[PDB]
Amino acid sequence: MYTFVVRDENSSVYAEVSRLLLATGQWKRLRKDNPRFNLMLGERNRLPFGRLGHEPGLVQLVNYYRGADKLCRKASLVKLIKTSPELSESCTWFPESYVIYPTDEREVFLAAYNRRREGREGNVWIALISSEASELLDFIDEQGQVHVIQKYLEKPLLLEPGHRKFDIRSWVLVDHLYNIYLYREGVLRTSSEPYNSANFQDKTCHLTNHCIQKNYGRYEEGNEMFFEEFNQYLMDALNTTLENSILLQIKHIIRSCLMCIEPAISTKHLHYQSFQLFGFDFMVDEELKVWLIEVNGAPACAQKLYAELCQGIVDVAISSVFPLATSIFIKLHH
Amino acid sequence: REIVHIQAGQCGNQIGAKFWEVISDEHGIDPTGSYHGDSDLQLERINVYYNEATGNKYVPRAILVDLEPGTMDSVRSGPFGQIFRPDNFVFGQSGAGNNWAKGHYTEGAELVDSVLDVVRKESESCDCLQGFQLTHSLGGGTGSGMGTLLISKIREEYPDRIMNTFSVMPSPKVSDTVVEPYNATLSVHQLVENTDETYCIDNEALYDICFRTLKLTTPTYGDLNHLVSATMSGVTTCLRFPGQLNADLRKLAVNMVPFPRLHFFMPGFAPLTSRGSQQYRALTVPELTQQMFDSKNMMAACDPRHGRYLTVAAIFRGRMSMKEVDEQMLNVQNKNSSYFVEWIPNNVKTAVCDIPPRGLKMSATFIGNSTAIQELFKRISEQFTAMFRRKAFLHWYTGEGMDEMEFTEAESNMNDLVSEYQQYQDA
Amino acid sequence: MRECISIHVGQAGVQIGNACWELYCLEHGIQPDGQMPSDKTIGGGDDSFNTFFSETGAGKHVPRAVFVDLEPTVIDEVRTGTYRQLFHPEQLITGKEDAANNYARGHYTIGKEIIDLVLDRIRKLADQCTGLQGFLVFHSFGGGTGSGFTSLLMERLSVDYGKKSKLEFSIYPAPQVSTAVVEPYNSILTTHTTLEHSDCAFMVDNEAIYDICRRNLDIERPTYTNLNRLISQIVSSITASLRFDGALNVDLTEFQTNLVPYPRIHFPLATYAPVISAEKAYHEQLSVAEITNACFEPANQMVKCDPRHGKYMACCLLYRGDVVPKDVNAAIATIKTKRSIQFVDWCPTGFKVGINYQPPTVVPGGDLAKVQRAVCMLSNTTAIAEAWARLDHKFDLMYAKRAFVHWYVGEGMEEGEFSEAREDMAALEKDYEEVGV
Amino acid sequence: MEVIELNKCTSGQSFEVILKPPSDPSLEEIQKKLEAAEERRKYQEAELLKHLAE
Ligand SMILES: Nc1nc2c(ncn2[C@@H]2O[C@H](COP(=O)(O)OP(=O)(O)OP(=O)(O)O)[C@@H](O)[C@H]2O)c(=O)[nH]1
Ligand SMILES: Nc1nc2c(ncn2[C@@H]2O[C@H](COP(=O)(O)OP(=O)(O)O)[C@@H](O)[C@H]2O)c(=O)[nH]1
Ligand SMILES: COc1ccc(N(C)c2nc(C)nc3ccccc23)cc1
Ligand SMILES: [Ca+2]
Ligand SMILES: [Mg+2]
Ligand SMILES: [Mg+2]
């Protein structure tokens, strides 16, 4: 009988994991403040990593990597890509991004803005989307908190029929041995109203969030296109598979990002062990080139896939450490 | 660090004589007082219970108290009777007649000054006195009434010393008189206020072990006392023997008692043996750990599953793997973490002594401060109220000067103790 | 030459003192009787070892050490043990009854009767010094004497010897080998009372030492003797620069300068490599690069914490054995590019290096093997605050119900002192937070 | 990279390597605290002896 604790109630993913664990009959749930646990399904903020791995006679495991927020916060990810030699300034899968504080790299941002202006090419940026620099900077000070100014992808790949924008979400699980497992099923979060090149004020067709969309449910249920349909579309419309055109670049970005942070976050020789599920968010342009948008520390699954992924998390992340008395993941080799 | 032992009444003297019988054998002392052992580990802290007499003859630091001459004559003509200092025998003539009031207020008050003179004479020999341990029953008159009178007077003369008791609880299953719940309630009221540590030795539990487990269909007092002396040996091991934990009476009190009143301990022993028949199969370390925590092995008739452990002290005796002991002790806590309070971190402590007791290759003794002990006090309270609501048998007490008010106060303080134990079961 | 007095308080302090002084003797070639055949100036001198040893006309080398316990049993073993002739009776102070795992009993009740006697015996050693620089205090956080009496002594030493430096060697409580349930109380209480009076404190988590003994020495269930022989090796590495000729950490003031820029954040993390089992047949001897690399593994630290998720304020590498500067710089260059070493923005990203050519001395018939080269890294990292967090949490759990508090109040201490001590600790946890993120 | 403060002798040598540049209570107060604690001990013992006198 192994023992676990739950410290995130809002977690829709680990609610299903805690449900599945009890269902085996070899796991017992303890109260929040019980120190005598094998597993911790911890909180999003202020997780007490310093208390872990100090219970004699117990192997302890947590569902978060300490330090992995450096990839998952927007300000941190830009700083990490720009400073680490493994990624370098010349990263070609990451859009031109700058860190801006309210009253820093403001003069560095404006130098690139003028090269775009004097080059007379596309000069549209995101923070909310605008073409003018002096109207963007005023919005940042008006909010209060730190934000990143990023190059907006003016020429994205557009699904037909509809002339629609989209983003890809990939679910990645890193285990205790630092194996990088990409879940074979991804999801395309789609816009339901056609992409307007001229009007940037219309936030409904430019942002592909599951909340902002909620023409909702026109082409596919809940604005969610799955991998079989998207592969099928690319074959018919562009004469290529999802594997070649998009997935090789996705596998490359995930692996490059986590290889970079490995020495800082790895729990290979530590007194406690970590795993973590990540949500990688991808943009595809019209030339079939993949760009990284954000990385998610506490991602939420899609309804169709909840059952399968949560069983996978138990199989390769939890049961690998605590064994009981076909594989759904692709292993990214390093 | 010296301990003065006092035994009061029939039960107190009978279990008391058995205690000195068992622990003298472990320290290698014959009935004459001469040392005939081989290990030096026996003598390193022999001064804890023994005084060294001239001519190199050991003498138990033991005072024998009764209001009747009957039982102390059984001790004197008994097996280890010659070892006790003849002056430390203090007796009255007319007895206490199973009456707390006679023990505490009338008959016992006549004799208590004589006992305290002997207590003082033993205390003055001591380089550094730890305090006192009393053996007594709570159901009689002498051990119950006079025993609690002694404690109160000892606390007055030695307020900076520890008071430890081995208190035998009455049961209808092993019953002398109907008035035992009265005597016990009056005694508990005194023990809650005037002792630092009390080992609750329930006669109900000793009977049930003898009947259900040991298979003795009609157990005597001798069968009951065999379990007591084996427990008493076990609980005092870390006082009697040098280890990694140099333990005394105060250190046990500091570490076991989180709140001053909640100092009633539930003792346990593994493996359970009966007299005569020797068990030939030695127990493995996982077997000892599983047994000592099981309710069938508890010397107080409580179910630990109906409560929560505040603190635990565990003592393993014999030659065994200390790594396996540590592994098994952590195994019990981790597999049953809900039964240990989360608000006292690392509340289970373990010690190992190399010397086993007589007739066993290896053994385990359990000292638990569980909230489940409230069941014992609830049982006494229920038996008390059944008689007291009709003021039955009360004339034996009012005849010696006691008011009904004193019973109501004693009933109240024990019911307070019960809800106080109940408090920490939930929060 | 400036003398140092070592003070060993309580069981843990005394027993570690036995281990350290046995080790110092073997290193300087001082025999159990006190004679030093290699020493040519008889009856005095101002060599580097004379920091720790004074000299009599007979040729005896006596430790500048005072042992104090409120209980006779532990120091009685020193009095009769193999090093009985080394100490003179007056250096060894014992009480009647110990502090019974109670801080308040050690500090207030039993402390008050012995405090004046101890300072008098300290004065007797101090008056033999031509230029006393200060004190090295050995004690447990968890014991009654170790927590209680130590903090009273630390208060008094600041009064009588105000211009002098005070260094701590402290034993952090671990459930694996602990003797008392109230050890988190004792630890928080002593830290609060001692914090202003200590200039540099080396914490040693019994949990770390215990696992190192299991993992690296193949000892199934480590005793105190096993732990103390290892702890003494670490202490010897730290103190070597006071006892031997050198230019790094030559005096006690230099420890504060090199390791402690923030007076309150005075707890450096010690890391030691290599720990190799004596009865291990065939061992491939580790190089400079390998043993320096082991200084950044958490499994080699004296406190289990993660330095990667914290900032450094200072760093010392203390090598013993066959080590040259060129090998050290090459090792540092490789390590920097492979690991997360983050200094604070107001400190140089650098290492102070001390090499002593004499390889580490091991106790004959010990658990530790003879090595060609060894290293002790002393680093002031904000990561050590993890140990404070653990301890404070355990304190909070018990204090919320006021569990065991009555034992402390019964010795004359006030309930306010508990929450005052906890507030200071909350402030200390905050100090590490400001510096560390 | 830069190796400064190099000092050698027969016993050993010491140096510093930089990789990157940057960017009490008195005796009267102690005797008062200890004796205030003794007064609280004496009071608690007196309240005990008074209770036992009853
Ligand atoms: N490393 C090490 N730790 C020890 C030793 N002796 C005791 N300890 C630890 O110290 C704590 C208890 O403190 P002690 O030093 O034994 O107690 P004390 O200072 O003698 O104080 P009292 O006995 O309470 O008066 C526990 O956490 C033990 O694990 C030792 O020889 N080595
Ligand atoms: N375990 C045990 N209980 C006893 C013994 N003798 C008497 N008792 C119990 O103690 C109670 C009577 O107390 P007793 O000691 O005879 O009276 P006293 O001599 O006036 O103290 C009854 O509840 C008995 O069950 C004994 O030898 N062993
Ligand atoms: C709950 O934590 C505790 C509990 C008791 C202790 N001491 C002091 C012990 N005293 C005695 C007399 N026997 C023991 C036997 C076995 C183990 C400990 C003790 C220490 C810590
Ligand atoms: Ca000399
Ligand atoms: Mg009788
Ligand atoms: Mg001690």
PDB file of N, CA, C and O and ligand atoms in Angstrom, chain B residues 8-12 14-15 66 96 98 137 139-144 168-171 174-176 180 203 206 221 224-225 228, ligand 2:
ATOM      1  N   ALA B   8       2.492  -0.614  48.020  1.00  0.00           N
ATOM      2  CA  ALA B   8       1.426  -0.462  49.016  1.00  0.00           C
ATOM      3  C   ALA B   8       0.254  -1.408  48.784  1.00  0.00           C
ATOM      4  O   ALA B   8      -0.233  -1.534  47.660  1.00  0.00           O
ATOM      5  N   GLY B   9      -0.191  -2.057  49.858  1.00  0.00           N
ATOM      6  CA  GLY B   9      -1.363  -2.932  49.825  1.00  0.00           C
ATOM      7  C   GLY B   9      -1.042  -4.344  49.378  1.00  0.00           C
ATOM      8  O   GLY B   9       0.118  -4.658  49.103  1.00  0.00           O
ATOM      9  N   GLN B  10      -2.073  -5.190  49.307  1.00  0.00           N
ATOM     10  CA  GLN B  10      -1.940  -6.591  48.876  1.00  0.00           C
ATOM     11  C   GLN B  10      -1.385  -6.676  47.454  1.00  0.00           C
ATOM     12  O   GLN B  10      -0.311  -7.250  47.238  1.00  0.00           O
ATOM     13  N   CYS B  11      -2.113  -6.076  46.509  1.00  0.00           N
ATOM     14  CA  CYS B  11      -1.748  -6.077  45.093  1.00  0.00           C
ATOM     15  C   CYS B  11      -0.391  -5.420  44.850  1.00  0.00           C
ATOM     16  O   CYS B  11       0.447  -5.979  44.141  1.00  0.00           O
ATOM     17  N   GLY B  12      -0.190  -4.248  45.454  1.00  0.00           N
ATOM     18  CA  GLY B  12       1.055  -3.493  45.338  1.00  0.00           C
ATOM     19  C   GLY B  12       2.268  -4.280  45.774  1.00  0.00           C
ATOM     20  O   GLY B  12       3.278  -4.285  45.078  1.00  0.00           O
ATOM     21  N   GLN B  14       2.304  -7.695  46.155  1.00  0.00           N
ATOM     22  CA  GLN B  14       2.390  -8.926  45.368  1.00  0.00           C
ATOM     23  C   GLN B  14       3.047  -8.714  44.004  1.00  0.00           C
ATOM     24  O   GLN B  14       3.978  -9.444  43.670  1.00  0.00           O
ATOM     25  N   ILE B  15       2.600  -7.704  43.251  1.00  0.00           N
ATOM     26  CA  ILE B  15       3.250  -7.342  41.973  1.00  0.00           C
ATOM     27  C   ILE B  15       4.636  -6.730  42.198  1.00  0.00           C
ATOM     28  O   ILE B  15       5.512  -6.844  41.338  1.00  0.00           O
ATOM     29  N   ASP B  66       1.740  -1.705  54.086  1.00  0.00           N
ATOM     30  CA  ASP B  66       0.385  -2.264  54.202  1.00  0.00           C
ATOM     31  C   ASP B  66      -0.213  -1.920  55.572  1.00  0.00           C
ATOM     32  O   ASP B  66       0.518  -1.653  56.526  1.00  0.00           O
ATOM     33  N   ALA B  96      -7.470  -2.094  55.975  1.00  0.00           N
ATOM     34  CA  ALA B  96      -8.253  -1.011  55.368  1.00  0.00           C
ATOM     35  C   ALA B  96      -9.638  -1.441  54.880  1.00  0.00           C
ATOM     36  O   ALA B  96     -10.433  -0.593  54.474  1.00  0.00           O
ATOM     37  N   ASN B  98     -11.007  -2.825  52.162  1.00  0.00           N
ATOM     38  CA  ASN B  98     -11.408  -2.386  50.807  1.00  0.00           C
ATOM     39  C   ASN B  98     -12.051  -0.996  50.739  1.00  0.00           C
ATOM     40  O   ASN B  98     -12.903  -0.733  49.886  1.00  0.00           O
ATOM     41  N   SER B 137      -2.818  -1.192  43.645  1.00  0.00           N
ATOM     42  CA  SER B 137      -4.109  -1.235  42.959  1.00  0.00           C
ATOM     43  C   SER B 137      -4.943  -0.029  43.362  1.00  0.00           C
ATOM     44  O   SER B 137      -4.727   0.558  44.425  1.00  0.00           O
ATOM     45  N   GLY B 139      -8.339  -0.383  43.366  1.00  0.00           N
ATOM     46  CA  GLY B 139      -9.614  -0.976  43.780  1.00  0.00           C
ATOM     47  C   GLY B 139      -9.764  -1.276  45.262  1.00  0.00           C
ATOM     48  O   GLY B 139     -10.883  -1.357  45.766  1.00  0.00           O
ATOM     49  N   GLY B 140      -8.640  -1.444  45.959  1.00  0.00           N
ATOM     50  CA  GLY B 140      -8.647  -1.769  47.383  1.00  0.00           C
ATOM     51  C   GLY B 140      -8.797  -0.566  48.290  1.00  0.00           C
ATOM     52  O   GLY B 140      -9.483   0.400  47.944  1.00  0.00           O
ATOM     53  N   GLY B 141      -8.150  -0.642  49.453  1.00  0.00           N
ATOM     54  CA  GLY B 141      -8.214   0.400  50.471  1.00  0.00           C
ATOM     55  C   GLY B 141      -6.859   0.982  50.820  1.00  0.00           C
ATOM     56  O   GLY B 141      -6.712   2.202  50.884  1.00  0.00           O
ATOM     57  N   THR B 142      -5.879   0.106  51.054  1.00  0.00           N
ATOM     58  CA  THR B 142      -4.516   0.509  51.393  1.00  0.00           C
ATOM     59  C   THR B 142      -3.812   1.091  50.167  1.00  0.00           C
ATOM     60  O   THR B 142      -3.478   2.275  50.158  1.00  0.00           O
ATOM     61  N   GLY B 143      -3.602   0.268  49.141  1.00  0.00           N
ATOM     62  CA  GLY B 143      -2.922   0.698  47.917  1.00  0.00           C
ATOM     63  C   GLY B 143      -3.603   1.879  47.250  1.00  0.00           C
ATOM     64  O   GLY B 143      -2.937   2.777  46.730  1.00  0.00           O
ATOM     65  N   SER B 144      -4.936   1.868  47.289  1.00  0.00           N
ATOM     66  CA  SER B 144      -5.774   2.902  46.692  1.00  0.00           C
ATOM     67  C   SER B 144      -5.781   4.199  47.510  1.00  0.00           C
ATOM     68  O   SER B 144      -5.385   5.248  47.002  1.00  0.00           O
ATOM     69  N   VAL B 168      -2.861  -0.645  39.145  1.00  0.00           N
ATOM     70  CA  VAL B 168      -3.719  -1.749  38.694  1.00  0.00           C
ATOM     71  C   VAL B 168      -5.208  -1.360  38.758  1.00  0.00           C
ATOM     72  O   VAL B 168      -5.737  -1.058  39.829  1.00  0.00           O
ATOM     73  N   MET B 169      -5.864  -1.369  37.598  1.00  0.00           N
ATOM     74  CA  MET B 169      -7.278  -0.989  37.456  1.00  0.00           C
ATOM     75  C   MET B 169      -8.227  -2.140  37.796  1.00  0.00           C
ATOM     76  O   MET B 169      -7.961  -3.282  37.421  1.00  0.00           O
ATOM     77  N   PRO B 170      -9.342  -1.846  38.496  1.00  0.00           N
ATOM     78  CA  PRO B 170     -10.283  -2.918  38.820  1.00  0.00           C
ATOM     79  C   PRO B 170     -11.211  -3.293  37.660  1.00  0.00           C
ATOM     80  O   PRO B 170     -11.568  -2.444  36.836  1.00  0.00           O
ATOM     81  N   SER B 171     -11.592  -4.567  37.618  1.00  0.00           N
ATOM     82  CA  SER B 171     -12.564  -5.079  36.656  1.00  0.00           C
ATOM     83  C   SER B 171     -13.572  -5.987  37.352  1.00  0.00           C
ATOM     84  O   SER B 171     -13.190  -6.734  38.252  1.00  0.00           O
ATOM     85  N   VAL B 174     -12.503  -9.649  37.465  1.00  0.00           N
ATOM     86  CA  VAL B 174     -11.583 -10.026  38.548  1.00  0.00           C
ATOM     87  C   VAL B 174     -11.886  -9.096  39.734  1.00  0.00           C
ATOM     88  O   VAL B 174     -11.207  -8.078  39.943  1.00  0.00           O
ATOM     89  N   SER B 175     -12.925  -9.441  40.494  1.00  0.00           N
ATOM     90  CA  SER B 175     -13.520  -8.523  41.465  1.00  0.00           C
ATOM     91  C   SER B 175     -13.483  -9.059  42.885  1.00  0.00           C
ATOM     92  O   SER B 175     -13.820 -10.223  43.125  1.00  0.00           O
ATOM     93  N   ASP B 176     -13.064  -8.196  43.811  1.00  0.00           N
ATOM     94  CA  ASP B 176     -13.079  -8.494  45.246  1.00  0.00           C
ATOM     95  C   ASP B 176     -14.355  -7.973  45.906  1.00  0.00           C
ATOM     96  O   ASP B 176     -15.041  -8.712  46.610  1.00  0.00           O
ATOM     97  N   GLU B 180     -15.258  -1.157  44.336  1.00  0.00           N
ATOM     98  CA  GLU B 180     -14.051  -0.884  43.544  1.00  0.00           C
ATOM     99  C   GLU B 180     -14.129   0.298  42.562  1.00  0.00           C
ATOM    100  O   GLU B 180     -13.128   1.004  42.410  1.00  0.00           O
ATOM    101  N   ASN B 203      -6.740  -4.909  35.016  1.00  0.00           N
ATOM    102  CA  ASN B 203      -7.046  -6.301  35.348  1.00  0.00           C
ATOM    103  C   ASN B 203      -7.962  -6.983  34.329  1.00  0.00           C
ATOM    104  O   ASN B 203      -7.864  -8.199  34.145  1.00  0.00           O
ATOM    105  N   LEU B 206      -5.550  -8.076  31.518  1.00  0.00           N
ATOM    106  CA  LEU B 206      -4.722  -9.190  31.987  1.00  0.00           C
ATOM    107  C   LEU B 206      -5.503 -10.498  32.019  1.00  0.00           C
ATOM    108  O   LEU B 206      -4.942 -11.563  31.750  1.00  0.00           O
ATOM    109  N   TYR B 221      -4.384 -15.020  40.365  1.00  0.00           N
ATOM    110  CA  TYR B 221      -3.634 -13.763  40.467  1.00  0.00           C
ATOM    111  C   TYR B 221      -2.183 -13.935  40.022  1.00  0.00           C
ATOM    112  O   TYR B 221      -1.603 -13.008  39.459  1.00  0.00           O
ATOM    113  N   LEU B 224      -1.931 -13.518  36.329  1.00  0.00           N
ATOM    114  CA  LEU B 224      -2.065 -12.083  36.090  1.00  0.00           C
ATOM    115  C   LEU B 224      -0.772 -11.317  36.402  1.00  0.00           C
ATOM    116  O   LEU B 224      -0.342 -10.466  35.612  1.00  0.00           O
ATOM    117  N   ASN B 225      -0.152 -11.648  37.537  1.00  0.00           N
ATOM    118  CA  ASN B 225       1.104 -11.027  37.977  1.00  0.00           C
ATOM    119  C   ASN B 225       2.326 -11.365  37.122  1.00  0.00           C
ATOM    120  O   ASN B 225       3.301 -10.603  37.105  1.00  0.00           O
ATOM    121  N   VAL B 228       2.287  -8.805  34.466  1.00  0.00           N
ATOM    122  CA  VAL B 228       2.627  -7.509  35.077  1.00  0.00           C
ATOM    123  C   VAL B 228       4.142  -7.360  35.233  1.00  0.00           C
ATOM    124  O   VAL B 228       4.713  -6.374  34.762  1.00  0.00           O
TER     125      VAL B 228
HETATM  126  N1  LIG E   2      -3.231  -7.922  39.062  1.00  0.00           N
HETATM  127  C1  LIG E   2      -3.466  -8.136  40.378  1.00  0.00           C
HETATM  128  N2  LIG E   2      -4.547  -7.540  40.948  1.00  0.00           N
HETATM  129  C2  LIG E   2      -4.832  -7.723  42.269  1.00  0.00           C
HETATM  130  C3  LIG E   2      -3.951  -8.581  43.082  1.00  0.00           C
HETATM  131  N3  LIG E   2      -4.456  -8.583  44.329  1.00  0.00           N
HETATM  132  C4  LIG E   2      -5.561  -7.798  44.320  1.00  0.00           C
HETATM  133  N4  LIG E   2      -5.788  -7.295  43.092  1.00  0.00           N
HETATM  134  C5  LIG E   2      -6.882  -6.381  42.693  1.00  0.00           C
HETATM  135  O1  LIG E   2      -6.822  -5.233  43.543  1.00  0.00           O
HETATM  136  C6  LIG E   2      -8.117  -4.897  44.048  1.00  0.00           C
HETATM  137  C7  LIG E   2      -8.155  -5.039  45.572  1.00  0.00           C
HETATM  138  O2  LIG E   2      -7.048  -4.337  46.125  1.00  0.00           O
HETATM  139  P1  LIG E   2      -6.091  -4.941  47.270  1.00  0.00           P
HETATM  140  O3  LIG E   2      -4.664  -4.645  46.881  1.00  0.00           O
HETATM  141  O4  LIG E   2      -6.458  -6.371  47.597  1.00  0.00           O
HETATM  142  O5  LIG E   2      -6.508  -4.039  48.546  1.00  0.00           O
HETATM  143  P2  LIG E   2      -5.464  -3.292  49.532  1.00  0.00           P
HETATM  144  O6  LIG E   2      -4.593  -4.401  50.075  1.00  0.00           O
HETATM  145  O7  LIG E   2      -6.364  -2.643  50.556  1.00  0.00           O
HETATM  146  O8  LIG E   2      -4.744  -2.281  48.668  1.00  0.00           O
HETATM  147  C8  LIG E   2      -9.098  -5.810  43.330  1.00  0.00           C
HETATM  148  O9  LIG E   2      -9.642  -5.102  42.207  1.00  0.00           O
HETATM  149  C9  LIG E   2      -8.272  -6.977  42.842  1.00  0.00           C
HETATM  150  O10 LIG E   2      -8.759  -7.457  41.586  1.00  0.00           O
HETATM  151  C10 LIG E   2      -2.788  -9.200  42.391  1.00  0.00           C
HETATM  152  O11 LIG E   2      -1.993  -9.943  43.015  1.00  0.00           O
HETATM  153  N5  LIG E   2      -2.626  -8.934  41.076  1.00  0.00           N
END
